[PDB]
Design a protein around this nucleic acid. Sequence first.
RNA 1: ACGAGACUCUGGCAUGCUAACUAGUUACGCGACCAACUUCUUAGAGGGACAAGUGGCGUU
Lengths: 189, 314, 65, 62, 138, 132
Amino acid sequence: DIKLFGKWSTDDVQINDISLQDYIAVKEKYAKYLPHSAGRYAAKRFRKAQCPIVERLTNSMMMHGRNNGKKLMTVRIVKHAFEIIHLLTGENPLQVLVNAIINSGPREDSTRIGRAGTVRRQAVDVSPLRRVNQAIWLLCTGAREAAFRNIKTIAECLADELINAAKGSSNSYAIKKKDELERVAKSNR
Amino acid sequence: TEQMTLRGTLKGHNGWVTQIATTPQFPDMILSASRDKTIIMWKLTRDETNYGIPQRALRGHSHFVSDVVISSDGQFALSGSWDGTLRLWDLTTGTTTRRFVGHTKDVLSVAFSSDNRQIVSGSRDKTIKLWNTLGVCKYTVQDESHSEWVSCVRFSPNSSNPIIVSCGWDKLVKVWNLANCKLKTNHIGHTGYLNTVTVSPDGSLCASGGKDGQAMLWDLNEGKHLYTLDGGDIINALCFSPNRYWLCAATGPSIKIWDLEGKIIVDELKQEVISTSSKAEPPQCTSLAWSADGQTLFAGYTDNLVRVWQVTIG
Amino acid sequence: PVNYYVDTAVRHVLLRQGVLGIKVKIMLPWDPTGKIGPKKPLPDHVSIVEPKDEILPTTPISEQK
Amino acid sequence: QPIKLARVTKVLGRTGSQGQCTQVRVEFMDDTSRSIIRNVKGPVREGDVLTLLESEREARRL
Amino acid sequence: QSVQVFGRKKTATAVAHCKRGNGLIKVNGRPLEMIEPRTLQYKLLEPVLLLGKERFAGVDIRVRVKGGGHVAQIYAIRQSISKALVAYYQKYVDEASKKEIKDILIQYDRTLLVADPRRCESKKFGGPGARARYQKSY
Amino acid sequence: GRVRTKTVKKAARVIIEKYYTRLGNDFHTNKRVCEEIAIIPSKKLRNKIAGYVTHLMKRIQRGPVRGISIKLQEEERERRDNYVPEVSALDQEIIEVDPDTKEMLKLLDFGSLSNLQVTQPTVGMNFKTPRG
RNA sequence: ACGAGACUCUGGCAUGCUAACUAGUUACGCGACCAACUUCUUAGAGGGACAAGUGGCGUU
């Protein structure tokens, strides 16, 4: 009866490996029924890295100057029509839910060279979190512009957001923008 | 000569034990002293299946107390902390009954006279006073007073005549009757500090504590020097057997038990847990509280763990 | 500590040439009681009570005539 | 392009005209463990695990 | 004979008057999940279904809930339920049941016992706010 | 940064040297004894002094530190200064002596000694470090 | 010896303490079965944090 949410559970989702919990980590007090836990992610570096990627995903829509930070907005977004989709799907959306975004992710970004010259960039990488969530931030911009002056709006992209959340395969768009940049800057190895 | 065997462990607490006090007349109230506004009860079971049960958590005390003393009757607990305050607790009501704020200086100890006649406290005016319950001046001695703070005043720990045994941290020991209160002998220039003095049940000994560990032994009529029992670091506990003549104290890691005819330990056989890290410092022991007569012993440390053992005495 | 350890006086002296201003600052000594100086010490000053000379024999032995 | 798990041993510092890249040294755990240095970006904390998708990218130092 | 530390957080508060009686739980001064702002009902639904009715079968609760601010009085309701349960079990039954159930509740989440210490800071010297300064010309 | 200034450092050194008896390893006990045996006019400074006293107690529990001259460690060191072996290290039955020092002793009127064993001189004159 | 620190003021924390007829209340209480030795607010002699504990780097 320690089952996560009212629907999920922590007793059947096992990987038999304790090296691959960098995307979903539900084993302690950090498990959240609803992400409105408050908190400050800018108090110190390595704390926005300590974020749960669900919370970072939903909150990082805090952009423009008028919709910035308002946690009521993100909690209402992730509650509304998620309450509908849970009873409207019945089956498992897990396949796409994981299999587009959470290994669409790139594998390298770049850095500046020497002291001058804005014509190419030395290819580097990070332990996956920073690069995946930089793709996530550019995807925040991308999903916004897919809503911003567009047709599919906010508080109704719950399918695509669960995709942007969960675990491991490749179909994304701003991530393939990042992968074009990946190859271009990776020609320097 | 005493053989014991550790039989178990105890898990679950918040406040490590500091001071010990019990009355054989009423054994239903057992108390423990802590540092987090916390006082915890015990009970007696002597079971391996159940060697401890958290039942009642006494609160109320704003400051971490120094010496807790119970009256002859197991009904009143006096916990006066390091400000001059006090807490009077009665089991008849389960709350506070008498809160006194009357001393404007930093007092360290408070005690009940065994005959419930006068109240003694240590003040920083180079003077000792005797106080009543009516707030009326009785006896203030300005001459030949202690060189520094008066630690406390002790009385007999059992059903026997009360004798005033004044103690201080200024390494001065005074024992006064109820009639004379006359300074007989004074000796100064001592190597180690004085923690506190203790009262003997047979009325011939008064040991003391200090970092030098040298047990101070004086008679009752005068200040004749008798013997200097050895010791370890700062001593915080001394007590005899209730019917037999022995000295037991815990001035550090191990147990320092001396028989006054032998004065030395016999055989130190102990049980300590193993640590997998080369830099994990073990805790520090303070006191050994006999359960009822010397058959069983309890102890507490700085590891949120309470260590107990079963002793056969002989 | 400059608020209660230093007392300041600024005064004007009028000469035929003009005005010269004088400024006298005194750092009071620490003294309990007497109102000669402030009661509290300098907050960066830590005090220790000093022991006395102890040249004693190995063991105390009572002496009687 | 194998995926290898390596632990950060030391953090060297930043580079650039104004400072825009980070240097760490990562050591392999299951590839006949040896010390290899590589520049990096973003929060790569004290002694974390840096994933090598490739064993040939080096850090050109100074 | 006065055991109350009530329930507060941030700006709001709730006087936890916990007393022995019939044993029904009074929450919100209103039916359980219809709160008019509607924003944060589900957080109240975690413990009341987690623990069970028998644990709170003797708790008569009377709370004066006040204060504007969702993050204040919300999550203070959960601070109050945890703390009232703690005090009730401590003063009435034992400490072992207290540590067990309190551990469950405060190991579900930490943010109960700790509020944000963040406060608006002073408008500083020669600027519109705490750190911003008026534009400098040359 | 958390660098302790001369005030707390010197106060801790004096407190440890003068009342090494009472201080322990716990911050709370060190705090209480530091408050008792010193007039520290601030509580933040008292806490800083007690913390450095705990740190230095850990330091001296693992050996001698130069800033503090506690009497127990000085007594131990002085006891080590009086250690004398059972037989003098100079009481060798045989002393190995080169031929040239034997000739010197002969010129020194000490040539009849039987403790001396004449060793073979090293046939290599290679005693200087190569230059470069 | 100054300056730096310490210091003063200010925030942030009390199943603690000192008590309020301007906040706050218990089954011989009504206007209703069809004088709680004081805690949310206020403010005091105090407490609390020290790089203190652990791990790793540092003529350790």
